[PDB]
């Protein structure tokens, strides 16, 4: 099964395959680069996640970071269960050396289109995954 999300690590002998990748080791020091993932189906049976070679912020995916406001307004750390509003989310974690894989599994429809973010840091480098999951038309 493919993971809809971002691989920020530089490793190829992994057991997890990601739809997207952004090698954080190649981002400039003090930079904050996005990796954007968009899911759009009437019903899901999907794995969503990231592979981070350093610190993950917040405690993804049980907690996630709200999307960016268009107004000058804060984005808070929230529980994913209440953010996407489905009660049977499955959470998974794995580690391959210094790489940390955090995933969640979603089955069925989502009541409303939602977005959220997870941040990955490695030394002075940082990258963040933004996810959007659409509700049925």
């Amino acid at each position, epitope marked *: 099964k493919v993971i809809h999300g971002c691989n920020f690590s530089s490793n190829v002998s992994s057991k997890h395959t990601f739809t997207d990748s952004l090698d954080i080791s190649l981002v400039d020091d003090s930079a904050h680069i996005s990796c954007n993932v968009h899911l759009s189906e009437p019903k899901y049976n999907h794995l969503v996640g990231l592979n981070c070679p350093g610190d993950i*912020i917040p405690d993804c995916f049980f907690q996630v970071y709200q999307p960016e406001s268009e107004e000058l307004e*804060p984005s808070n750390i929230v529980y994913l269960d209440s953010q996407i509003n489905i009660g049977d989310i499955e959470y998974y974690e794995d580690a391959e050396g210094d790489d940390k894989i955090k995933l969640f599994g979603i089955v069925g429809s989502i009541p409303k289109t939602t977005s959220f973010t997870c941040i990955c840091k490695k030394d002075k480098k940082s990258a963040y995954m933004t996810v959007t999951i659409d509700s049925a038309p």
Partner: antibody
Amino acid sequence: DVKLVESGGGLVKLGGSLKLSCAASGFTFSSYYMSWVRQTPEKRLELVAAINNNGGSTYYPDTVKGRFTISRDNAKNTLNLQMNSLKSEDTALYYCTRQHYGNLYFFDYWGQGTTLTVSS
Amino acid sequence: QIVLSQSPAILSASPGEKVTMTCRASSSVTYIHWYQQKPGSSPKPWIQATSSLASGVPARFSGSGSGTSYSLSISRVEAEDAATYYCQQWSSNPLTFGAGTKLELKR
């Protein structure tokens, strides 16, 4: 290296006006939110004004709203603070500092500050 | 409007001691950032998003918390840790800081 250099501070009479400026270098200025954060003589830190990456959205706390205006020029890499009807309580060291949506709005770089003294 | 109350105002310590300073919020906040300031310079990033150390910050520092109570700990104080530590929230406008805890060396 990321650098933020404030200028424009000085002595202003009560009710006076003054413009502060911050020169940013060593990073993509237009990707970051920018703020003016002041440090009072009692060492309290207070946000004065915040502006988003493109300059379309701003925020001011009620202590300076209407009196202060923050703006940025993404062609020149500069941040400005226009301060009107200055009060004695506005006397502080004013720092220029950045945040990113993608770093959870963490002030990861600050300038050395420019001093404002409001007195007649 | 959200008030961050830092205690103690002055944390007296000898090098080698294990210490903790607290940041209590008047209402719930979803994270706290910490900054370190020494006389003559601006505040520096210290702890990002409650518990992630900023680049270059030694492993003896840690941060923890949730809701209305957060903290910063030093497992073994060093003389260079004498500084003021500020906590900061941005769960609602306006973004606010605590008044700081000044880590002071005993004699």
